[PDB]
Amino acid sequence: PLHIPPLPCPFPSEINEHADAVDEESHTWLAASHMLKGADTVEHFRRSKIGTLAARTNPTVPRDSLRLINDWYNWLFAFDDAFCEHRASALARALPPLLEILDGRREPDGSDAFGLALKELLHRISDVASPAQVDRWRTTVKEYLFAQIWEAANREVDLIPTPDDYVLMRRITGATYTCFALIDVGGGYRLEAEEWHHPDVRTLSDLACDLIGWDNDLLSYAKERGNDKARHNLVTVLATHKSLTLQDALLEVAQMHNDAVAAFLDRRAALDRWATLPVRKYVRGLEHWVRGHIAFSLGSARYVGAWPDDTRWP
Amino acid sequence: AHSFTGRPLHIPPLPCPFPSEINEHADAVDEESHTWLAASHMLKGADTVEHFRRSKIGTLAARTNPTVPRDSLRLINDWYNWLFAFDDAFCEGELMGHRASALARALPPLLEILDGRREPDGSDAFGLALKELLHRISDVASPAQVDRWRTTVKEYLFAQIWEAANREVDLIPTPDDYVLMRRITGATYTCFALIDVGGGYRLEAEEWHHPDVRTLSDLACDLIGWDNDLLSYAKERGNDKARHNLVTVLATHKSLTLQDALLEVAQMHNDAVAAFLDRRAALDRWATLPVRKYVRGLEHWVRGHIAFSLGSARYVGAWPDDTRWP
Amino acid sequence: IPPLPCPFPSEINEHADAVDEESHTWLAASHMLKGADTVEHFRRSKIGTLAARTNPTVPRDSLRLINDWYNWLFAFDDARASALARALPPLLEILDGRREPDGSDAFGLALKELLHRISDVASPAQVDRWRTTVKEYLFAQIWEAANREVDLIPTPDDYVLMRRITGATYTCFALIDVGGGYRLEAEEWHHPDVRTLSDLACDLIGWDNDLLSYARHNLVTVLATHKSLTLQDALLEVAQMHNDAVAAFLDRRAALDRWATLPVRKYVRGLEHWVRGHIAFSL
Amino acid sequence: ATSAHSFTGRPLHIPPLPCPFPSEINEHADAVDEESHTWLAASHMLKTVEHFRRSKIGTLAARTNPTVPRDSLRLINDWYNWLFAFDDAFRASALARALPPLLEILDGRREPDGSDAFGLALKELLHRISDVASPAQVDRWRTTVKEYLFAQIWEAANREVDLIPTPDDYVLMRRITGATYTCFALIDVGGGYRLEAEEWHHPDVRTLSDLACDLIGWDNDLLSYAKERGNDKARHNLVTVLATHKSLTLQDALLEVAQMHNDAVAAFLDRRAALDRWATLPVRKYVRGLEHWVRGHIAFSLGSARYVGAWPDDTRWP
């Protein structure tokens, strides 16, 4: 029997007071968008309680911010499942129409579910964000879209990516940065250029991004075995490239998690010496995101049901 | 050069009211930067290094950055030499450039170097040179400026996968897809990102990201990409059917003669210049000194680039002798 | 008394009466007011109605902080040039965040508490923005005393310039972005268009207060004295200046609308709420 | 001008003002100084002129701004000339009432009178700063000038009632009575760069700026003490303030100013080490600007006929 290692995290575990209402509202939005073809797919999303992830990762934001962020999470889950998760060339050639919409240079066709929804989200983000904040978000979305071609490339040649390549690319394949980009926007504040881009702030963002990607890899491993051999998963990557048992691969992912937490706490102590209020709120945002994501992933029907009944949990 | 049309082509004029200037350090820095490129071992062939020497890449750096001090010009000239060498050897090359999956899978080691997360291998000429340039930019730029440059480089690298995607299935991109992607496949934004750095100043978040500044930057980027497409068309017929070229795209998708394709590129250039002058008038009403300096930077870049493209051995020699110039 | 037309929205913070009571209790606890009659006058004045009408969008905690600051200003206004100038360095020391205040000055103790509470919800740049406006307001008081000391009515040009800083309006404009939980960047705040709108709004509030409250430091008196006008003609010229400033505000706002970021738009709506809310409170 | 022997009847020892900051001078010092002195002559602000010439104001500009290009040094040199002339040339009530016309010129709401030498010059300098600075940078400078002008009323208030100000009041007010902040406001402008709001206003950067401002004011007070004895009993001078309020001999007051100097240097180095952990390149250039200002000011003041000449012949120099 497999033992899932614990994912210790000293960060506060909180949830937005608007979780229940906004989750239902954002799910209804997703259903109305026609981004998902199957009624069964719509129901699987509903059961996953995507709005619980939104509320746990953004526990401080006002209701209208949570709703906007929840709609964005729903777009990403839908897009990730429907577009991304065969042939790198076909998928690369599909991107420019979407990039046109993202740059606001073209009206989507009436039949383009993903384009119509992305246009609406860009407009709604633009209503509550500065041009710098909008571009910050847009840049992260573009990197995410192009990162999906890299996943398609690995599937096309039927290779498990190497640890070095995977850990680098996992930071942008997961879209976590596109959600970090809405922390200040969601809270109604705005980090200045040298606040946002400060090496300490970037380092904490990168470690938070690693933690969320790796934590999802550990907990989503079981359901990913059912889809292209869990190719894009640190458990599969370490098992394959270090010739580990599944149990030892799970433990190595837990080790990398613990080491990233240690690295986060160290850099945070340095940042604490100089950080302004806006930077402190953003870093607390990263902490809520990492901890809220673990709470969500351990409890979501998206991940839990795929684990065999005899799997042990900490 | 062998003629590729039934009757001589007339290269249309590329009118531009922007000042045409050259950095006073052009001659000395061109030679210094070329020596740096040769010393880097990024280019394997002596013949390749010689064709780069003949192209006078430092003339492009000096014309596009005419105001910057010598140390700035040298750094920017080294960056242009990196881009020319990399674009020719990697992006448009036989091994990586003809399959989306191969090019995509080759990027992560380079991205690692770009993020300052890894020492290049002693034999990785492109990686060692990129690490050196990252460090030299970091010496004279704020973290926001370095990240801005790094972001434009990542956008450029990812964009190359799309070019490879087109080569792989042997298709000419449609006009709408090509004009969108041509703004990021050409690395022009990575050079715009060094205008404030080069001049010793720094646009703040809302200056850089202001819709008016982004619009002028996008129009400048269009002009440079299309102007390069017009003048590099002849040399590009010799590699991959000039697939990534507005002339090929319009000729193919609108069923135009090459002469009519060239004229439609010139019309698009004239439209972009008119759009630039219109948006510049709006920006003039609010622009701070740093924003005005950056926009003058865009104007110098567009005009200096036309002068380079009309005069560089990289482009001129591939045109048949019966080609009429503007 | 001529009308003061104003196309800016008239709104009130829903927390007006709850926070007015809380803030008045805070003022009574501060001992900044000596007389029981003065404390009762302040209670009945509903200073929190001015705070709520001039800051109608801010959350309750922001309204409470701003209401306490208005109470500090009104108390400080209620309580010669040389004496005034020499009284400032101890307030400045508290303001600088350089030393804890003595039990000795009620104004110092409360100013320190407000600085701490502003620092808790503002960036260092925002705190320094507010500090600068408070210093200018304090130094501006000396100028008023200078005129009183030699029994002079100030000239129109001197009065209109100094009236912008004698009234402390800029100290309240400095808490608009803070109160709303956002922050204008240096080049947003200091853009000539944003400074011009800030200055026109400050002009309007000062001139509106002068006219509605109508003595030596009053635009009606200044114009009547220096332009040899009847009281009625002085009142009308003040109303004309008001209408000209409103017109100037709308035209400059139209120019700003071309380029303004969302934070700048929110701030400018803040100026509009302040001008209109001030008139609503005064009437 | 001065005495052979001490006004105390014992030779006075001027304590050293130790400082590990590099002493540098702008390569354009001599040329720009002459040009700036010409400018001042042409302004008609001086009606004094010969002592300024001998004082070599341009040497202070060049020592305090050693890295800036020639055009920046010239602008800064003209501004120093404006300040030295104004401090010399300029009752609390009369002084307070003289400020608004100057404030109007500063805020562009008024043209100066054809006869207003100081207003005409201030207008020209504002426009020349505006030519090479962002609106935020111009407002930074404008704000420090206003604070400087208002601070002169506090000096007039003490003079009017004949009070020596207390150490706590004087030390606070000395940071704005001296106009030092108006010169710090041109460090980034002079260098062709610009600190962001949260760079400029960071507590570490404000602390270093305030300590640098303290150092320059106290160092000037120590070295200008003899000259200021001949002007309103050296009322506005830390030596007078400490001697009066802490019941010190003048010799012990000089030594206490040097102790405060050494304490401020130590505090600067400690805070600079903390700032080193986060500082961006523009912040590092500005902080190096503060160091050059403090050190260049000591070099200038110790060698200046403006200060050295007033001390008795038996004074013991460091």
Ligand SMILES: CC(C)=CCC/C(C)=C/CC[C@H](C)CCOP(=O)(O)OP(=O)(O)O
């Ligand atoms: C893009 C997306 C799916 C969701 C958006 C919300 C989000 C950033 C969640 C954090 C978890 C992880 C990085 C999601 C993407 O990985 P992966 O594709 O392995 O997600 P899965 O394990 O749920 O399938």
Ligand SMILES: CC(C)=CCC/C(C)=C/CC[C@H](C)CCOP(=O)(O)OP(=O)(O)O
């Ligand atoms: C990236 C590079 C090659 C040069 C760096 C300098 C630069 C941004 C030049 C502007 C011209 C054009 C956008 C070059 C890339 O396209 P293309 O591959 O069509 O250039 P080519 O026509 O010279 O081959």
Ligand SMILES: CC(C)=CCC/C(C)=C/CC[C@H](C)CCOP(=O)(O)OP(=O)(O)O
């Ligand atoms: C304002 C002025 C005089 C010059 C501008 C240059 C400047 C800021 C010099 C630093 C030294 C000191 C603060 C001068 C003002 O004090 P004080 O009036 O005691 O100077 P003094 O000792 O030269 O008379």
Ligand SMILES: [Mg+2]
């Ligand atoms: Mg997925």
Ligand SMILES: [Mg+2]
């Ligand atoms: Mg995925």
Ligand SMILES: [Mg+2]
């Ligand atoms: Mg997963």
Ligand SMILES: [Mg+2]
């Ligand atoms: Mg290319």
Ligand SMILES: [Mg+2]
């Ligand atoms: Mg090429």
Ligand SMILES: [Mg+2]
């Ligand atoms: Mg080309």
Ligand SMILES: [Mg+2]
């Ligand atoms: Mg003085």
Ligand SMILES: [Mg+2]
């Ligand atoms: Mg002195």
Ligand code: NA
């Ligand atoms: Na700010």
Ligand code: NA
């Ligand atoms: Na000011």
Ligand code: NA
């Ligand atoms: Na700025």
